[PDB]
Design a protein around this ligand. Structure first.
Ligand SMILES: Nc1nc2nc(C(=O)N[C@@H](Cc3ccccc3)C(=O)O)cnc2c(=O)[nH]1
Ligand SMILES: Nc1nc2nc(C(=O)N[C@@H](Cc3ccccc3)C(=O)O)cnc2c(=O)[nH]1
Length: 259
């Protein structure tokens, strides 16, 4: 039922990754909602269940496959399937708990993790922060294998958590931010794995706030500036949507657009 987008780390290139992220964005957004040249994800309110999710099927050089499920309203990775087992993060609310019952319905073994899927919880379980977790094609290749082998006892919980952290940033954050997509393209182009710098981290941390600030802005002008960081960790202020047009690719729905 739900749309499937395929990506493989096997022989991945800048172009194949770019095609993938574009396809993901295309399935996340309808084109109904564009504000200051920035697309907005579907409003959760009244969104029919048959339109709630997309599936991202990840394959690797090891000839393994996992399927991530993403909530279209926020690009949130709600869980995954590997073969005969599916695993879901502890849902944040009753609506999201009901929604996941519509995913991977013909899978033999369904599990809900006792932990939620936010970075803070996943970093705790990984024993490492995002700033110390390497990203790139190699990390993603390894993450796919780690997710695949979890059900059979091959993958320790910290490795699983780290693997989620990799997938979320390389798929969902890249979909949300052209800037983060660009940073992943760079890693792929040179086949060089590296942890995300502060510019990446602060963007990830600020997505909800940036979405709200843009949508609540007066003709694009923020009431309150938002502090982001450069690659070197130095702070700069965002006062307006204009500077964010090349940086943010999609926003979570926060309010109705003004007349
Ligand atoms: N599972 C999952 N978790 C996420 N957590 C965060 C996060 O904690 N952001 C500050 C952001 N995005 C995601 C996501 O897309 N999927
Ligand atoms: N489907 C599903 N969705 C979730 N969304 C969230 C969450 O933090 N949502 C933010 C918006 C957001 C900000 C950054 C990154 C992603 C989303 C919010 O409510 O304002 C947490 N948890 C979940 C979950 O467990 N399942």
């Amino acid at each position: 039922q739900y749309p499937i987008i395929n990506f493989t780390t096997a022989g991945a290139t800048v172009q194949s990754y770019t095609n993938f992220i574009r396809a993901v964005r295309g399935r996340l957004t309808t084109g109904a909602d564009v504000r200051h040249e920035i697309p907005v994800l579907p409003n959760r309110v009244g969104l029919p269940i048959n339109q709630r999710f997309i599936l991202v099927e990840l394959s690797n050089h090891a000839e393994l496959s996992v399927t991530l499920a993403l909530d279209v309203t926020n690009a949130y990775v709600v869980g995954y399937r590997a073969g005969n087992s599916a695993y879901f993060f502890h849902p944040d609310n009753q609506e999201d708990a009901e929604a996941i019952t519509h995913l991977f319905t013909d899978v033999q073994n369904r599990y809900t993790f006792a932990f939620g899927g936010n970075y803070d919880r996943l970093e705790q379980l990984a024993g490492n922060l995002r700033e110390n977790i390497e990203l790139g094609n190699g990390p993603l290749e390894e993450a796919i294998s780690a997710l695949y082998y979890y059900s059979t006892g091959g993958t320790q919980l910290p490795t699983l958590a780290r693997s989620f952290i990799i997938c979320i940033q390389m798929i969902s954050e890249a979909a949300r931010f052209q800037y983060i997509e660009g940073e992943m393209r760079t890693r792929i182009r040179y086949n060089r794995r590296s942890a995300p710098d502060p510019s990446v981290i602060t963007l990830e941390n600020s997505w909800g706030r940036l979405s709200t600030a843009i949508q609540e802005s007066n003709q694009g002008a923020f009431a309150s500036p938002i502090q982001l960081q450069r690659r070197n960790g130095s702070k700069f202020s965002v006062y307006d949507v204009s500077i964010l047009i090349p940086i943010i690719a999609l926003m979570v729905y926060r309010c109705a657009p003004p007349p």
